[PDB]
Symmetry: C2
Subunit: 312 residues, 2 copies
């Protein structure tokens, strides 16, 4: 599925070709973010969902800063079919208020009628300028972390200047080999590609587990955006990735230090309500017929996580 | 595909059950070098007879041919393919050709294991549950290492555990895996896990399932367990929890898999390839995970 000229096309990219006509696949809305800077209660609207681990990132930052009443939300259906992400009735759906769209693609198009590109979440929508402010997770996270600080946000700097270099090092490997790793693996079409993705993925877990040995968080001893982008992948791992995406060299459950980080975070009031594994499980098994044609959702692993029990 | 008249095809009514229930009577016979065994490293059914052949020390009185891991549009095949040995009897390419050599008008499923009488140039028995009983005895006069895995004194217990284990485990992984509707899926393995539970409780205290004998109930059962965490858990969505999660089942798996004689019949690498490569309906990408690195924890059982 792409938006081709404001028209929704589940048919190639397309007939001609690369080209023919070239289609930009990156996040095309990189606003917010600039010099100075940042915003306003009641002004911005978050589009997101429970399946996407990229959207999860912004949900976790929206909670951690307590922007839940300053930044409203709409939440899409777990089934991604002919029309892609949709707001049709269903588990955990929260409708497109202001715009009343049936399909996520209609949000992009409401703003720019000929839009050509992918139609993704999360989207930070500027309600006043009636358009997308920015729709790249990594970026939004930062937008939400810096100044709403000004206007009632809970204190919290998850990108400490003192540490940006190290955070950066980690976000990069984690992004490339893990965040996007589980997808490169699950969607790979040749065995070689599957192995060439899957193995670096575990090399990265093997590394993260060491780093975490006498630590509580990835960087210094502070929850930071490093963990916040690692956690969405972990939380879905054993319960979705390990099976569906074949990431099964071992379980996150088999990495004591990581399993501990996941428990810590899945136990935080605030983060906990942003998790909905039933929904993710359903979106992943039920929306990828290339990989899982019956669409049947495994009776899952029963109890894919832990709690928090190794203090003193 | 079926052997229809045959005529290999991907109106007649084919019969599901295996059709050659030979052997089995009063007399045996069980001469050395007379019988040929057609199996493979992937198929659990086959694995039963591979084990019973290895336990009764009959691996030289009974020659094997070992099918190729990829079940294609032709079926089990002997093509030079990776993991094993060809048909020294009819130099056949496809397993179906074996069936056909004996009965050029055969109608049935083309399956393994097979007990072939090299002399009558026909199929004796092609039924796992039966083949193991033949091997367990009819050779004892002629050289079999002593063993009785269907000891008369227990046939009732053995027979009853077998029934449950068959219809909901042995056969349950498959039914849950090829189930095509969430509803059917759940109808199949919720009750399969029920049996793992039953089996776990039941195996508490015991070292084997029946008698303190390693018995055929254990051989019928090992093949499903040993493939379970590597293939079934993943590929057939049998994932409620691992066999690693059941301590006594694990105890039993280790105990058997480390048994010399038995260990040599286990090729999980081959198994994985076959399941993940041969069920496009279940796993169309054909990729074979990697996955899990140590399926069955090693071996350490004692006081």
């Amino acid at each position: 599925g792409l938006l081709i000229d404001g028209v929704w096309r589940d048919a190639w990219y397309d007939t001609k070709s690369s080209g023919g006509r070239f289609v930009r696949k990156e996040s095309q809305y990189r606003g917010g973010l600039d010099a100075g800077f940042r915003g306003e209660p009641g002004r911005y609207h978050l589009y997101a969902g429970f399946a996407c681990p990229w959207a999860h990132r912004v949900l976790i930052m929206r909670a951690l800063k307590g922007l839940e009443e300053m930044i409203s939300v709409s939440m899409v259906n777990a089934y991604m079919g002919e029309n892609g992400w949709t707001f049709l009735p269903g588990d955990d759906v929260v409708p497109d208020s202001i715009n009343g769209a049936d399909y996520l693609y209609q949000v992009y198009t409401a703003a720019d009628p000929t839009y050509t590109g992918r139609v993704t979440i999360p989207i930070l929508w500027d309600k006043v300028e009636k358009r997308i402010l920015n729709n790249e997770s990594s970026e939004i996270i930062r937008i939400l972390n810096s100044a709403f600080d000004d206007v009632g946000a809970l204190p919290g700097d998850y990108y400490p200047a003192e540490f940006r270099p190290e955070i950066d090092r980690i976000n990069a490997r984690v992004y490339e080999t893990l965040n996007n790793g589980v997808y490169r693996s699950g969607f790979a079409t040749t065995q070689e590609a599957y192995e060439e993705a899957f193995y670096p993925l575990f090399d990265t877990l093997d590394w993260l587990e060491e780093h975490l040995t006498g630590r509580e968080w990835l960087v210094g001893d502070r929850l930071t955006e490093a963990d916040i982008r690692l956690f969405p992948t972990l939380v879905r791992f054993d319960a979705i990735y390990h099976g569906h995406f074949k990431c099964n060299l071992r379980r996150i459950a088999d990495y004591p230090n990581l399993s501990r980080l996941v428990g810590k975070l899945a136990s935080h009031e605030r983060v906990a309500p942003t998790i909905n594994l039933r929904h993710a499980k359903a979106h992943y098994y039920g929306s990828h017929p290339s990989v899982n044609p019956t669409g049947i959702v495994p009776v899952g692993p029963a109890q894919p996580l832990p709690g928090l029990t190794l203090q003193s």
